[PDB]
Amino acid sequence: QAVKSLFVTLRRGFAGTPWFHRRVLESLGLKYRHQCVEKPNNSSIRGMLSKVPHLVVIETDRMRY
Amino acid sequence: AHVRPRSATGGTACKWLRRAGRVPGRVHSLPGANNNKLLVHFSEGDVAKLIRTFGRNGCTARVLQLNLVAPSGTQLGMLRVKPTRVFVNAVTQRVEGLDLIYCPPERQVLVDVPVRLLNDDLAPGVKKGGWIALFKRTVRYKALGGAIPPYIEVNVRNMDLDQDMLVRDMPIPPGTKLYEKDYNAPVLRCTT
Amino acid sequence: VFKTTGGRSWNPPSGLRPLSPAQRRNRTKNLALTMKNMSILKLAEANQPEVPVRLYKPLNFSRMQWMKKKLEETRAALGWDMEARALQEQARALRVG
Amino acid sequence: AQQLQQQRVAEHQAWVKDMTTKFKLQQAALRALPERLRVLAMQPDHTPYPLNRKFLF
Amino acid sequence: CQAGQLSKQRVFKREGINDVIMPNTTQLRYGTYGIRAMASKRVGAATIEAVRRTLRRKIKKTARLWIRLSAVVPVTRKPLGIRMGKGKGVIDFYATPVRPGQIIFEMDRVPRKVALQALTAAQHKFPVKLGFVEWS
RNA sequence: GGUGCUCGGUGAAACCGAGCAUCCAAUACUAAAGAAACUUUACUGGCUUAGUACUGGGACCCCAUUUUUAGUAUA
Ligand SMILES: [Mg+2]
Ligand SMILES: [Mg+2]
Numbered sequence: 289q290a291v292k293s294l295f296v297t298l299r300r301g302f303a304g305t306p307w308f309h310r311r312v313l314e315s316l317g318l319k320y321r322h323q324c325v326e327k328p329n330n331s332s333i334r335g336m337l338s339k340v341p342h343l344v345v346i347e348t349d350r351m352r353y
Numbered sequence: 354a355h356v357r358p359r360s361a362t363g364g365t366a367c368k369w370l371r372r373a374g375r376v377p378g379r380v381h382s383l384p385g386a387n388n389n390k391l392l393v394h395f396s397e398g399d400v401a402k403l404i405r406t407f408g409r410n411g412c413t414a415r416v417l418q419l420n421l422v423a424p425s426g427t428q429l430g431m432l433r434v435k436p437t438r439v440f441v442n443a444v445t446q447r448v449e450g451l452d453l454i455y456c457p458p459e460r461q462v463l464v465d466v467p468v469r470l471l472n473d474d475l476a477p478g479v480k481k482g483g484w485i486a487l488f489k490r491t492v493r494y495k496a497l498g499g500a501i502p503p504y505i506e507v508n509v510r511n512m513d514l515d516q517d518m519l520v521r522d523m524p525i526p527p528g529t530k531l532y533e534k535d536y537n538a539p540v541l542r543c544t545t
Numbered sequence: 546v547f548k549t550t551g552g553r554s555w556n557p558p559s560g561l562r563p564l565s566p567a568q569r570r571n572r573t574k575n576l577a578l579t580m581k582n583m584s585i586l587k588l589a590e591a592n593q594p595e596v597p598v599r600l601y602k603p604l605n606f607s608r609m610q611w612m613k614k615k616l617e618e619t620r621a622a623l624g625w626d627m628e629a630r631a632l633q634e635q636a637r638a639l640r641v642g
Numbered sequence: 643a644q645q646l647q648q649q650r651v652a653e654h655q656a657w658v659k660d661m662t663t664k665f666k667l668q669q670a671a672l673r674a675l676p677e678r679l680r681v682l683a684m685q686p687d688h689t690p691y692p693l694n695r696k697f698l699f
Numbered sequence: 700c701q702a703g704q705l706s707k708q709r710v711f712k713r714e715g716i717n718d719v720i721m722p723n724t725t726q727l728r729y730g731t732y733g734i735r736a737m738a739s740k741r742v743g744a745a746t747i748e749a750v751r752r753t754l755r756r757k758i759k760k761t762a763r764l765w766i767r768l769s770a771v772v773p774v775t776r777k778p779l780g781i782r783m784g785k786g787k788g789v790i791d792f793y794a795t796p797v798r799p800g801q802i803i804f805e806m807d808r809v810p811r812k813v814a815l816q817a818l819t820a821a822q823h824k825f826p827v828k829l830g831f832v833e834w835s
Numbered sequence: 836g837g838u839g840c841u842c843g844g845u846g847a848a849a850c851c852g853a854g855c856a857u858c859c860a861a862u863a864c865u866a867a868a869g870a871a872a873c874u875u876u877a878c879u880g881g882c883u884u885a886g887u888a889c890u891g892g893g894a895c896c897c898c899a900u901u902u903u904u905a906g907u908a909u910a
Contacts, residue, residue, distance in 0.1 A: 289592060290592055290593070290594040291588065291589040291592045291593060291594075292594065292597075292598045293598055293600065294585075294589060299578065306881095309881085326600060327600075328597060328598050328599060328600055329589050329593050329594075329597055329598060330593070330597045331590075334586055334589065334590055337582070337586055338583065338586055338891085339881085340881090341579050341582040341583050341586070341881090341882095341890085342575070342579045342582075342881075342882060342890095344582065345578055345582065346581075346582045346585045346586065347585065348585060348588075348589065362874090362875095363891090363892090363893085364875085364876075364892095364893085365889085365890065365891085367875075367876090368889095372887070377874075377875070378874070378875080379873090379874040379875085380874095381873085381874075381898070381899050381900095382899075383899070383900065387872095387900065387901095388872085388873080388899065388900065390873075390874070390899090392874065393874095404835070408834075408835035409726070409835050410726050410834065410835065411835065437897080437898050437899090438722055438875090438897055438898065440720075440721050440722065440874090440875050440876070441720070441721075441722070441725060442720040442800075442876095443718060443719045443720045443721075443723070443725040443735075443799065443800020443801075444718065444720065444737055444799050444800055444830075446830075446832065449720065449721075449875060449876070450721075450874065450875040450876080451874085451875090452874055452875070452897085452898070454898065454899070462898095463898075483760075483761050484761045484807070484808065486763070486807065487731075490731070490834070530864090534865090535865080535866085544763075546884075546885090547884080547885065561884060561885095562884090563884070564884065564888095568884085569888080572883095572884095572888055572889095573888070575882095575888090576882095576888055576889060576890095579882085579889080579890080580889080580890085583890075583891090643842095643843065643844090644843080644844095644852090646842095646843090647842050647843060647853095650842085651842070651853070655853080655854075662855095673910095717877080717878090718876090718877070719876095719877075720875095720876065720877075721875065721876045721877070721896090722896080722897075723876085723877080723895090723896080
């Protein structure tokens with residue numbers, strides 16, 4: 289039941305978003321809406337994701353399977 | 354006073370507790386070695402009852418019997434606790450916290466006892482003219498756990514203008530030390 | 546938003562028009578997604594394996610093009626004995642193979 | 643100069659040891675006796691001196 | 700209701716919105732029956748004297764009136780035809796900052812029914828809402 | 836064996852000979868200052884129709900733990 293990775297999907301856009309949330313979304317590797325990337329589970333990725341929880345849809349690899 | 358242990362709260366559990374109809378609080382005494390404080394949540398009916406029949410800023414002159422209730426080894430618990438600094442609101446005057454102190458029958462707890470003023474109707478100074486002012490209402494002093502005094506009755510049968518009741522002379526129960534004794538400040542004055 | 550006066554109609558003459566149930570349904574859906582995001586973050590923090598997972602990433606396009614340019618300018622800047630020297634150890638590797 | 647400090651140090655120290663021992667005796671004197679005897683013992687006033695006490699001539 | 704000082708100084712901010720809900724200047728300290736505000740509003744000296752006489756009309760000589768607010772904040776108002784700019788205007792009137800939890804009129808043992816009667820006339824002449832608080 | 840208050844001694848040092856307070860080798864109250872902990876809440880970051888749309892951080896003061904003192908007591 290160990291969370292090996294996370295799957296992060298944009299549900300919002302880039303327009304109207306402040307530049308620092310925009311930079312966090314850039315460094316997560318998300319560019320377009322409805323785009324899902326697979327991210328590791330370490331404290332760096334979790335810090336990036338906790339900065340922007342209202343713009344993304346996070347899900348566990350087991351959940352996505 | 355039915356309460357529950359309230360494991361982990363900040364300011365968001367407290368807003369949800371207040372919406373759920375509960376009032377938070379804690380008991381702090383170091384009963385066993387360090388303080389081992391216990392967080393608790395009461396109800397607005399219980400807290401309103403204490404602040405109505407005993408009043409706010411008073412109510413610390415009694416040792417209420419707390420009831421630790423589960424929401425058996427879970428539904429058991431009764432502690433002797435004394436109120437300290439009930440947290441009222443300054444707009445709607447609702448009460449948001451209790452902060453009680455555990456008060457076993459032997460204790461050196463500080464108690465803020467009120468002033469009841471025994472004989473306002475009869476005094477020579479009050480009937481020459483006017484009334485009497487009460488500057489130091491609720492004089493606080495040390496007490497014992499099993500003998501906390503609910504009321505302090507200052508004797509006002511014989512006071513006149515320029516005759517003041519000082520904090521130094523007050524009814525002192527046995528084993529109940531006055532906290533501030535070196536001061537000579539006017540608790541009562543016949544101001545006209 | 547939040548303007549009643551000033552000649553520009555950002556609102557009706559009444560200073561707003563409050564939330565229809567469609568708007569409240571949309572805000573409830575978005576808040577539910579945000580709550581599941583931070584709950585999933587707490588669960589992933591509490592269930593992270595020791596020696597965490599590294600995923601395979603390729604070189605980005607900038608390193609890739611830079612290092613292909615660098616490798617192509619190694620190829621022009623090689624000495625005369627070099628490809629025979631590489632071929633000798635290439636043969637010697639597969640004699641031991 | 644060692645002797646010069648020794649004279650004053652020995653004289654002043656012997657005198658202040660005498661005063662502190664007298665202070666010890668007057669501290670321990672007034673305890674085997676009831677409170678009225680304390681009241682006579684703890685009266686902090688003195689009669690003015692009679693001036694007929696001629697000093698070292 | 701006037702700034703009892705030597706300097707005709709000037710101010711920058713005219714607001715007092717901050718809440719003191721916990722034990723923070725929320726209990727009565729001089730009287731036993733108190734009148735408090737419920738929302739923040741900067742109020743002028745003329746209103747303070749008008750409410751003070753309006754509730755003093757319902758107060759006997761054996762009832763002290765502990766006022767808690769003193770008008771010591773200069774307010775600068777420009778005259779009618781002055782164009783916008785060219786420095787700060789002259790001091791016109793004195794005002795006070797009122798916070799949502801401040802008791803502004805606290806009374807002694809004048810009866811609670813008469814204290815509630817005085818509160819109604821005070822709240823009629825006052826711009827922001829008023830509330831009843833007692834020593835209890 | 837410890838710090839000081841100063842008499843002197845040289846080298847400018849710092850220690851030496853004295854002689855009192857505890858450091859050890861006390862308990863029991865009171866008034867100061869600090870230390871770390873913490874309920875509640877102000878205050879805030881993000882979100883925001885301006886907070887029965889939320890969520891993270893989080894004081895000050897009081898109470899309670901305790902340290903450096905000083906003053907008043909004990910045989
Ligand atoms: Mg956007
Ligand atoms: Mg918050």
